[PDB]
């Protein structure tokens, strides 16, 4: 049920993106391996975003940005999110292609906070409905 599923899926995305932020920033783990490790833990359908991303990166001459965008479009219809989440997730991809280290980091944090905010909106809509 979409009102119910949406907050839960945002919460999962916030978890997974926090882990990827760390690996990008100070990890010694290749991004494809980090994403696959997350995919193994998360429930479907959000898990498939991360396994698709891992595949695209691994067997790919694609930038991380391009691999992310492609994985996002591929899985999008399986998720229970609104367009506002899509745009946030797209901005997260665009962020992977930022070369300035500090600016990239801060734009990843913005994505995460944006999801925190959308999670609240989604919980508020749910609660309104009950």
UniProtKB/Swiss-Prot annotation:
Chain's gene name: spoIIIAB
Record has Ligase as a keyword: no
GO biological process: sporulation resulting in formation of a cellular spore
Part of the whole protein covered: 27 to 152 of 171
Protein name: Stage III sporulation protein AB
Keywords: Sporulation
Lineage: Bacteria, Bacillati, Bacillota, Bacilli, Bacillales
């Amino acid at each position: 049920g979409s009102h119910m599923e949406r907050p839960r899926q945002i919460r999962q995305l916030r978890a997974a993106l926090q882990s990827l932020e760390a690996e990008i920033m100070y990890g010694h783990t290749p991004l494809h391996t980090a994403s696959q490790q997350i995919a193994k833990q998360l429930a479907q359908p959000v898990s498939t975003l991360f396994s698709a991303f891992s595949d695209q990166l691994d067997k790919g001459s694609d930038s991380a940005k391009t691999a992310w965008e492609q994985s996002l479009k591929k899985v999008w219809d399986t998720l229970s999110l609104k367009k506002s989440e899509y745009e946030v997730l797209k901005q997260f991809g665009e962020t992977l292609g930022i070369h300035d280290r500090i600016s990239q980091q801060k734009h990843i944090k913005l994505a995460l906070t944006h999801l925190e905010a959308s999670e609240a909106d989604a919980e508020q809509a749910q609660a309104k409905n009950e």
